[PDB]
């Protein structure tokens, strides 16, 4: 139905620090014959579940340094790969990927696995999408760990969530250009640019899912959706703001990668005001957009903060 391709399994043979066993679902409702990959780590009977959402242009490999810390605390960790990314299947046409298409998969996943007592861990697209999930079923969400992310609202209601698209030239403009223009997109090169501390090995794990451009339709569409917000995304994101400001009563932990040109402090302080009860942020000076590459410190501090209220 949805024409999609699948990454050969040998592409992930030599992954660095990725000893997690795959789990798949190819029976989600709305996603017929599409196989989704996700990690299920720690005790599968734990009370607490960390749902780790990744963004553009990565996969669950991004949470590889946080996963073990959350699991050792006694929690179950779910880290799904969105369709078009990591080990999940990849639809071939960019038109298949929409805000709701990826949002509905997350609601499908959550219902399917029956996740409860969720600690939402988001960043980037993990957050554009994931911050709109709680209002759908408030009872399954109990905590949030938010790294550089915001809501894809309209420019008027929140200019801070729209300004970064145009300025500065070396921020989101550069980012989108690097991703949607090359006809020969090398994700290892892109990642080493955007996450200067990655080793060669780690950079190649980010390119691992895409043997050639025919596999990167989802990678291509995400930046375009930051640029061109459809009505449903706007409506839903706008309504999530209200949920965070007035309905949210859980615990929150915010961490900012201070070197981020995209969603750094001019985006995160405003986000911090809209999230009821959000405490002071943990500013990580050396981290850029991929805060998770400095993930062990974030996981440990968040658990620390969470223990001093539970
Ligand atoms: Cl993007």
Description:
Chloride binds at residues 125, 175. GO terms for molecular function: epoxide hydrolase activity; haloalkane dehalogenase activity. The chain has helices at 67-72, 99-113, 125-130, 160-163, 169-180, 187-194, 200-207, 217-227, 231-247, 265-274, 295-307, and strands at 4-5, 23-25, 36-41, 49-52, 76-80, 90-91, 118-122, 141-147, 251-257, 282-284. It is an alpha/beta fold and 310 residues long. It has a single domain (1-310), classed as Alpha/Beta hydrolase fold, catalytic domain (Rossmann fold), CATH 3.40.50. It has an 8-stranded mixed sheet with strand order 2-3-5-4-7-8-9-10, with helices on both faces. The longest helix has 17 residues, at 231-247. It is globular and about 45 Å long. Residues 56, 222-223, 226 line the site of chloride ion (CL). The site of chloride ion has 4 residues, from helix 8.
Q: What structural class should be given to the helix and strand makeup? A: alpha/beta
| Overall 3D shape | globular
Largest sheet descriptor: 8 strands, mixed
CATH class division: Alpha Beta
Q: How many separate domains make up the residues?
A: 1
Can you say what the CATH homologous superfamily is? Alpha/Beta hydrolase fold, catalytic domain
Strand content range: 5-15%
Give the radius of gyration.
18 Å
Bound molecules: chloride ion
Structure summary, number of beta strands:
10
Binding site for chloride: 125, 175
Catalytic activity: 1-haloalkane + H2O = a halide anion + a primary alcohol + H(+); 1,2-dichloroethane + H2O = 2-chloroethanol + chloride + H(+)
GO molecular function, one term: epoxide hydrolase activity
Subunit structure: Monomer.
């Amino acid at each position: 139905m949805i024409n999609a391709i699948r990454t050969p399994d040998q592409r992930f043979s030599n992954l660095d620090q990725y000893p997690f066993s795959p789990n798949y679902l190819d029976d989600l409702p709305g996603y017929p014959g599409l196989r989704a990959h996700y990690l299920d780590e720690g005790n599968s009977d734990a009370e607490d579940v960390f749902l780790c959402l990744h963004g553009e242009p990565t996969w669950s490999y991004l949470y590889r340094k946080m996963i073990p810390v959350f699991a050792e605390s006694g929690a179950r960790v779910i880290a799904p790969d969105f369709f078009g990314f990591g080990k999940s299947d990849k639809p071939v046409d960019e038109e298949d990927y929409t805000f709701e298409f990826h949002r509905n998969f997350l609601l499908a996943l959550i219902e399917r696995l029956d996740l409860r007592n969720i600690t939402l861990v988001v960043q980037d697209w993990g957050g554009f999408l994931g911050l709109t999930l709680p209002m759908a079923d408030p009872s399954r969400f109990k905590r949030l760990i938010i790294m550089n992310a915001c809501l894809m609202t309209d420019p008027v209601t929140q200019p801070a969530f729209s300004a970064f698209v145009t300025q500065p030239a070396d921020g989101f403009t550069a980012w989108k250009y690097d991703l949607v223009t090359p006809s020969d997109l090398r994700l290892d090169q892109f990642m080493k640019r955007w996450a200067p501390t990655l080793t060669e090995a780690e950079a190649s794990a980010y390119a691992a899912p895409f043997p050639d451009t025919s596999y990167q339709a989802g990678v291509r569409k995400f930046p375009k959706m930051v640029a061109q917000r459809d009505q449903a995304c706007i409506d839903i994101s706008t309504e999530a703001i209200s949920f965070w400001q007035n309905d949210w009563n859980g615990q929150t932990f915010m961490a900012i990668g201070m070197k981020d040109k995209l969603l750094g402090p001019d985006v995160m302080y405003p986000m911090k005001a809209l999230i009821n009860g959000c405490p002071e942020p943990l500013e990580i000076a050396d981290a850029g957009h991929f805060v998770q590459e400095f993930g062990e410190q974030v996981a440990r501090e968040a658990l620390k903060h969470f223990a001093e209220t539970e």
